[PDB]
């Protein structure tokens, strides 16, 4: 199929996502509405249920206002069953209606509607070229006090219809037990309860075995893609195992969200998105974009160094999900603010490198603050404003322009207030001119680009003040003056004669596993696919076409691999790296070492056999281990994604900067688990 079927699930460039919060789009049934103090059809109190539904959403689908916008997906909150409380926090009723207080990961929520209303909107999306996305929020259940049984429904998680156990007098130990965290380090926020959320615990062979059979079950209802919640707190080697077993399965875009404010720049987000087997949401594009679109605290060049920055630090960077706001951030569009900031800041989005994800509502300019403030119902479904216009004329781009979907990003003019770069893959460009001075006209002179000769016409009809490009020989513009506010589109495509790779999905998987390999130039006769020299042709490669090919991971040794293709003619692409060839299925085993003295600076780390631990190498060992919660100095713990039913061998090892001290004694080995859980607990070997 072409890299911009609907079937493609892997991967996601040339899509357009919409972000629904489903209670707040639209009632297409209200019999399935919360009745009581739980409901407000006038959607006044924006913590109560306002009514919306998916019989809403396949209703937009149908009469043309979601399509007609050029949206290929749809994000929408978590589909599975919620707490029924109406909750009073210190005055306000507060309900479920966000979806995130969930009680059966197997079952739905009845106020979105029963598992014949999900699959009738799966089957109406896919009828209509759109993916679904949905969250999924494994870390916890819902509001609990393990003091006082009787508060919302202590936390309760049940499977398909049967009690597995509460927060109250939790035997099983199927929940966290430690407090509440502080946020103080990144420990702390894994093992302590997120606020007052019953957090679960994937150290238990059940919660972890009933976590990867309920996505399991979603994954076989047909969903396109998987929004993680609050990846940051939950054990990476346990989401590690997760998305291990998602892809070894039915491999589908997954993504998580890692909230990061302006100008942070983390390492542990960018390893995060570039070792755990999923992307992020992209909150450095989006702090930045505010900060140049919309507050003016920095100007074009923090963009162009955001830009430029963020190609090299996120290994696969055309997996981001992009974005100006969304549910954890006031809305983009303010009181006092000029409709023309957000429409060129969504023209920026669409034609950025990721996968664009537009917030309900952006297109009919909704203001509001934070939650539950920027999740109020959308006042109008009005086709006709310019910024549903801009979508709609833009959003196309992502399926017809490679460029657009995968190319890399080049800037070409700049000064404080204008932009003007280029997208360029292969033979297929785009070039975006922006204006953000609402007041002062731009005189552009010495533009060169790599369009052909030609008069280039505005994608955008000169809606938001764009103008025509003329291009002489050399790629060299005619000069000309950008209008206050101005922005303008300009495209080029073509056929390019060479392979050439924009995205590969899975990046993480098991010997056997069919991963997609997406971009243009690959020709129509069955060619070569090389993991490191190794060379894969023929029955392994299962569909080959010009914009995709469909290939089984050949029987390597684990590790990560460079991924090239050659066509049928023998040339050969660019290489897409960091790929990850698991040793085999995963289970996650907890690493326990008592008396491991250090001293400031010092930090336990494991290493092993298998390339899972980082095959004996001490610069990829796992860790810093975590000493302050479950277990505390001198004794050490991590949770470790390790492949399962396998004698693995290991050491542990300190680390200050430069130096590594081993343990001392023979190596250390241990049979893993086939499914569920383990855990190692042993102590230091002089
Ligand atoms: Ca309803
Ligand atoms: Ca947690």
């Known amino acids: 199929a072409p890299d911009t079927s609907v079937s493609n699930k892997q991967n996601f460039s040339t899509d357009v996502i919409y972000q629904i919060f489903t ?9 399935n509405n919360p009745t009581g103090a739980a409901f407000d059809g006038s959607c006044t109190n924006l913590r109560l249920y306002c009514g919306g539904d998916w019989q809403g959403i396949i209703n937009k689908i149908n009469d043309g206002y979601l399509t007609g916008m050029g949206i290929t997906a749809i994000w929408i909150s978590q589909p599975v ?5 109406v909750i009073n926090y210190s005055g306000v009723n507060n309900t479920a209606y966000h979806g995130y207080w969930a009680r059966d990961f197997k079952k739905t929520n009845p106020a979105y509607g029963t598992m014949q209303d999900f699959k009738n909107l799966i089957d109406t999306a896919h009828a209509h070229n759109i993916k679904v996305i949905i969250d999924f929020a494994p870390n916890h259940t819902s509001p609990a006090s393990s003091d006082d049984p009787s508060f919302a429904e202590n936390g309760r998680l049940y499977d398909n219809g049967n009690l597995l156990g509460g927060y109250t007098n939790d035997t099983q130990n199927l929940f966290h037990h430690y407090g509440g965290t502080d946020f103080s380090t990144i420990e702390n926020g894994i093992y302590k309860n997120l606020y007052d959320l019953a957090d679960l615990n994937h150290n238990n062979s059940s919660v972890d075995v009933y976590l990867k059979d309920a996505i399991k079950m979603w994954l076989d209802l047909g969903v396109d893609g998987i929004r993680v919640d609050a990846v940051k707190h939950m054990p990476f080697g346990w989401q590690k195992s997760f998305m291990a077993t998602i892809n070894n399965y039915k491999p589908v875009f997954t993504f998580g969200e890692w909230f990061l404010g302006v100008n942070e720049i983390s390492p542990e987000y960018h390893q995060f998105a570039n070792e755990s087997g999923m992307s992020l949401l992209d909150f450095r594009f989006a702090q930045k974009a505010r900060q140049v679109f919309r507050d003016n605290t920095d100007n074009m060049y923090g963009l162009k160094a955001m830009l430029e920055g963020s190609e090299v630090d996120y290994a696969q960077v055309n997996d981001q999900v992009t974005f100006i706001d969304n549910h954890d951030m006031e809305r983009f569009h303010t009181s006092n603010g000029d409709r023309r900031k957000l429409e060129q800041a969504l023209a920026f989005t669409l034609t950025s490198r990721g996968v664009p994800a537009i917030y309900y509502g952006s297109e009919q300019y909704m203001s509001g603050g934070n939650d539950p403030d920027n999740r109020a119902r959308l006042p109008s479904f009005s086709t006709t404003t310019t910024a549903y216009q801009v979508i709609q004329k833009l959003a ?23 932009i003007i770069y280029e997208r360029k893959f292969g033979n297929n460009v785009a070039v975006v001119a922006i204006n953000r001075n609402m007041n002062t006209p731009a005189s552009i002179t010495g533009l060169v680009t790599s369009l052909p000769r030609g008069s280039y016409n505005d994608v955008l009809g000169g809606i938001l003040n764009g103008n025509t490009l003329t291009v002489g020989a050399g790629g060299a513009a005619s000069n000309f003056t950008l209008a206050p506010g101005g922005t303008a589109v300009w495209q080029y495509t073509t056929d390019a004669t060479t392979p050439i790779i924009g995205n ?12 997609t390999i997406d971009g243009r130039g690959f020709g129509s006769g069955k060619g070569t696919v090389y993991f490191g020299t190794t060379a894969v042709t023929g029955a392994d490669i299962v569909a080959w076409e010009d914009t995709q090919i469909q290939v089984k991971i050949p029987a390597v040794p684990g590790g990560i691999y460079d991924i090239r293709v ?3 003619a023998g040339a050969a692409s660019n290489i897409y790296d960091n790929f990850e060839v698991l040793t085999g299925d995963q289970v996650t085993v907890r690493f326990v070492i008592n008396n491991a003295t250090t001293a400031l600076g010092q930090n336990v780390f494991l290493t092993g056999n298998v390339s899972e631990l980082g095959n004996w190498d001490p610069n990829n060992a796992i860790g810093p281990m975590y000493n302050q919660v479950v277990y505390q100095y001198p004794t050490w713990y991590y949770d470790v994604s390790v492949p399962a039913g396998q004698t693995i061998e290991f050491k542990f090892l300190k680390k200050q900067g430069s130096t590594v001290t ?25």
């Open 504 to 515: 590969v999905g899975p990046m993480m998987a098991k010997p056997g596993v069919t991963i």
């Open 396 to 418: 196309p781009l992502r399926k017809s322009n490679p460029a657009i979907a995968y190319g890399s990003t080049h800037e070409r003019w700049i000064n404080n207030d204008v």
């Open 566 to 568: 050659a066509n049928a």
């Open 23 to 31: 209670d707040r789009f639209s009632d297409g049934n209200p019999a």
């Open 662 to 686: 081993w343990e001392g004694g023979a190596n250390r080995t241990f049979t893993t688990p086939t499914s569920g859980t383990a855990t190692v607990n042993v102590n230091w070997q002089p």
């Open 81 to 85: 069953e919620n707490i029924y409380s």
